[PDB]
Design a protein around this ligand. Sequence first.
Ligand SMILES: COC1=C(OC)C(=O)C(C/C=C(\C)CC/C=C(\C)CC/C=C(\C)CC/C=C(/C)CC/C=C(/C)CC/C=C(\C)CC/C=C(\C)CC/C=C(\C)CC/C=C(/C)CCC=C(C)C)=C(C)C1=O
Ligand SMILES: CCCCCCCCCCCCCCCCCC(=O)OC[C@H](COP(=O)([O-])OCC[N+](C)(C)C)OC(=O)CCCCCCCCCCCCCCCCC
Ligand SMILES: CCCCCCCCCCCCCCCCCC(=O)OC[C@H](COP(=O)(O)OCCN)OC(=O)CCCCCCCCCCCCCCCCC
Ligand code: SF4
Ligand code: SF4
Ligand code: SF4
Lengths: 45, 207, 178, 155, 318, 115
Amino acid sequence: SKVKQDMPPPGGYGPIDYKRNLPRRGLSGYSMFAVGIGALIFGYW
Amino acid sequence: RPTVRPRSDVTHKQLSAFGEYVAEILPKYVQQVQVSCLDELEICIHPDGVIPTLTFLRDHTNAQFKSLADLTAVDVPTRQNRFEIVYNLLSLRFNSRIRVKTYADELTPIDSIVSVHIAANWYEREVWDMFGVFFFNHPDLRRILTDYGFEGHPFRKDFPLTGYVELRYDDEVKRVVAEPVELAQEFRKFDLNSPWEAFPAYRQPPE
Amino acid sequence: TYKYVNKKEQESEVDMKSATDNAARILMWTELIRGLGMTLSYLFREPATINYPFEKGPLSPRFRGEHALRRYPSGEERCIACKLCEAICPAQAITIEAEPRADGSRRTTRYDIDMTKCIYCGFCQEACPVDAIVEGPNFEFSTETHEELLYNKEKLLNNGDKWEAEIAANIQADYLYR
Amino acid sequence: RAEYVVTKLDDLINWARRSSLWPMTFGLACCAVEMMHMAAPRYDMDRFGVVFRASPRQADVMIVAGTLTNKMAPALRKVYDQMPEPRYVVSMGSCANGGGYYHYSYSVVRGCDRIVPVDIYVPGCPPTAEALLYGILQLQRKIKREQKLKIWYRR
Amino acid sequence: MFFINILTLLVPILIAMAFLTLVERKILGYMQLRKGPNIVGPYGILQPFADAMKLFMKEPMRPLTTSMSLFIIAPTLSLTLALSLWVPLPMPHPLINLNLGILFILATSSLSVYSILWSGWASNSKYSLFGALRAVAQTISYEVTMAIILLSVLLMNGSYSLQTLITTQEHMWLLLPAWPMAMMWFISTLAETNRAPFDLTEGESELVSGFNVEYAAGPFALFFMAEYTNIILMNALTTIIFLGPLYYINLPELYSTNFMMEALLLSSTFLWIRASYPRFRYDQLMHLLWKNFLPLTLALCMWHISLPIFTAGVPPYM
Amino acid sequence: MNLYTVIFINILLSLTLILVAFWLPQMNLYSEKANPYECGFDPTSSARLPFSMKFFLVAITFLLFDLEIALLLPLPWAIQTIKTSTMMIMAFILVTILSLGLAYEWTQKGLEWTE
Ligand SMILES: COC1=C(OC)C(=O)C(C/C=C(\C)CC/C=C(\C)CC/C=C(\C)CC/C=C(/C)CC/C=C(/C)CC/C=C(\C)CC/C=C(\C)CC/C=C(\C)CC/C=C(/C)CCC=C(C)C)=C(C)C1=O
Ligand SMILES: CCCCCCCCCCCCCCCCCC(=O)OC[C@H](COP(=O)([O-])OCC[N+](C)(C)C)OC(=O)CCCCCCCCCCCCCCCCC
Ligand SMILES: CCCCCCCCCCCCCCCCCC(=O)OC[C@H](COP(=O)(O)OCCN)OC(=O)CCCCCCCCCCCCCCCCC
Ligand code: SF4
Ligand code: SF4
Ligand code: SF4
């Protein structure tokens, strides 16, 4: 009977992310303003 | 020895040197300076020097204790002045802690240190509410933890654990009324004191 | 060490493209749309709600539930009227009046536990030298009167007889840690 | 038969009052921490139809969850009195049940039943959120058993 | 036959708002990683009925310090104004066809604000007074913005009617010609309905319950019915004005179906907003409207004055 | 007549609902129940004291802007006019002076909630 206890694995646990992670997405400002202006002009016509 | 703490004689010596420093800077008020084996510095002063001692420790260049950690009282009802008022102060600049002690009785107030630390406002309100130690020049000194109509100071040693009154709803007067306390259980005190002394280092000399 | 949470390093100057990006962020409510998308993803996730009275929440063999007085496999009560569980009881919730029995064994006559006074801390079951008092897994024992939570020795022995098939298994799974 | 119609109407009103239980956004201590753990997504009281309302005028049951201090007791009594008539009380935890750890304190009401009439006592310190949900369902069964129209009809 | 028409307008709207309460609870739950009610009904569909029966079988509990006349008048006023506001909507044929339908809508909304104010002042309590004053500030800001928005949009339209809006949006929506007005109108409908982010009249966290803090069950249920009916109505008005459903003279059923789908989408959008965002401060709402929307909508009102003149696209009178 | 009947039907429906709410349940009225709420304590004041609102200038400006709204609202019939140049100029001038008043008030800190 050997000592059995709650222990980590011999290689250790894996990496754990802890830093802030934001997706950093979205269209550019020029594209959004261009599609808005195009919708405006099309609707006006 | 894996079951005994380390000692840190270096910080014991540092606190002893600073105790000498404060005791010689303020001989008018300092009555005793001691350093425990847990490396904590206690300075026991006269009650008249609470304001100068706390101001010196708040803003002296070598003793910047600008943060007040704790302000409490200990009721020892066998000495003549039965209340020991204790200030625990923190030095962020020098990363240190100091303890300043003064004494009071039921009819001897102590000057409040609200002009030195603003946390002392509520801390001295708590001390007055729980021990009946009045504080001079305290803005709106009043009860803070007891009930509004509460009588007596419950943290005193002579005050009972259960108090003198208890509240119950009365349907005749349609109110929450106070009655003399009557326990259905009667809290059983236990005499958990061994008749053999445990620490010969604290054996008091016989009377 | 330390780090800043809101301090910025230098500045990104003023540029037409960056100005247009900030203008579109302000006018088109981009972070608001992003928060909408986040809670939409949470809408399309699977909820964590369990069907309560049919799917119970998970527990552990160490769990402190309703108190019980146990017995030896012979049927004899384990309690030997030693009162140190009420000595260690931080709420003074136990009353252990006792006397010698007809056969001369040291047993209890009154073993009351006030469940309205008990703080469910397990100090009695970790202080008991014979594993007599235990805190078994019953937690759904809410009553409609205050008096039903004032247990006596008959109630505690009934709980011990009721829950012995589970308490013994939990103590078997747990006793090597304690 | 008037007895059958009255019994079925009483069952209908009991079903309504037990399917729509609105406790008050009112807690005191760690027991109220477990109360909002009962509000948490795991044991969804809103799935049970139980949803907090801040005002006592829109509340149905006071879940006394915490230590009822002497200074607190007039506030609790006033808040309970300000409820409308079909109101219930679930005492939760040892403090609200019988004082608990602070039974011999000078400032603690030894049980909230000294102040308000308690319908259901939930033991624990703290009782688990599962146990509080058990007490809530036991209260639902208790007000399912009520026979107000039948007692009125035989009155 | 007209009373049958009144019933077929009123009863489906009340069932729709009760199930709007159900849909709100379930959508908020599923966005909160939990469920909605699923025990009272087969899928929770009996939960609003159980809530309604419980509220109407609790006592109304008239208070002592309370102007009873206004205290009783205000919730009935709120409910009857919500239904009166539901009256003139065309889907695609209104129950009551009004020439100045939008003006009628604005007048009825302002009177609903008066219902909230009278309830808050009559229930003589400090939190009720706080809720009433917050309602005053909120309706100041959104009233001026909403009036300008509707002026510009109906200048793009012809008269002040709503069948004219149907015929205007016969070929294309009004969202594409005036989408900034649609965004500001959506925010203004949130402010009108006193919904999250800027509810501020029934603020559960800043106040206890706002203007309902002294209203027990009964008239409180009346206030809740009026609020949720107004939610469905503002979304319905938004989809009639801006997201024009397909209209064909031969069959109107596809118009009604398209209107239903878009109104459901915008109501779910309201619940989505409530799940997503925290609350404004009620001075921040006034600052936001009067400093961002009001200058932009004044400029866009001027632009929509100039647009049919320089494009020769002046709408017809009829 | 039709709109009148619908208005009266809605009013009668609301009255019927509140009459059911008041005559259906069981009443038990006493003083502590009907006292004002005040978060579980007796109110210090009478809740009828002066309140001292902080946006009074914004309220008066709202009155003036509401009447500017009333001026601006006949535009859908105004654009049907035969002249349209004086109409366009007049609408531009009205919106411009309204915007100038708003800008002047913003500069003079009128809408800033002076405490
Ligand atoms: C550390 O320090 C401490 C704190 O600090 C942090 C504390 O906080 C604290 C106190 C702690 C607590 C009190 C814990 C309580 C828990 C919480 C605060 C968190 C739980 C979360 C919430 C409160 C937020 C809930 C969020 C939601 C999204 C839920 C939704 C809730 C709502 C109210 C909105 C939805 C609406 C309803 C539920 C009701 C809607 C239904 C109706 C009104 C029905 C009306 C309908 C009709 C009348 C229709 C009738 C008409 C018809 C035609 C029907 C026909 C009928 C027929 C019969 C035919 C303590 C003690 C403390 O120590
Ligand atoms: C009904 C149809 C659908 C509508 C959209 C519904 C879905 C999206 C819902 C999103 C969440 C909304 C919840 C409430 C949010 C409340 C906050 C908020 O919106 O604040 C407003 C915010 C306010 O931002 P802010 O308050 O952060 O701004 C900072 C300002 N200070 C520093 C002074 C405080 O944005 C706006 O006011 C913008 C309004 C819309 C602007 C639209 C402009 C369109 C482009 C015009 C033309 C451009 C070209 C120019 C000419 C070129 C010629 C060639
Ligand atoms: C709880 C108390 C509540 C009291 C307040 C009630 C508020 C009601 C709802 C809000 C009303 C706001 C004002 C609306 C006025 C009508 C709008 C309108 O445009 O009406 C004109 C219209 C016909 O005009 P037009 O569209 O040009 O048609 C011509 C060719 N089709 O139609 C007409 O000409 C019809 C004219 C009559 C319409 C209104 C009828 C109101 C009846 C009185 C209600 C109050 C009675 C007192 C209280 C009773 C007891 C509580
Ligand atoms: S669990 Fe703790 S408080 Fe409860 S009876 Fe045991 S020792 Fe006493
Ligand atoms: S239960 Fe255990 S600890 Fe308590 S008196 Fe009996 S034998 Fe002693
Ligand atoms: S019974 Fe225990 S958990 Fe509950 S309030 Fe008291 S100390 Fe906290």
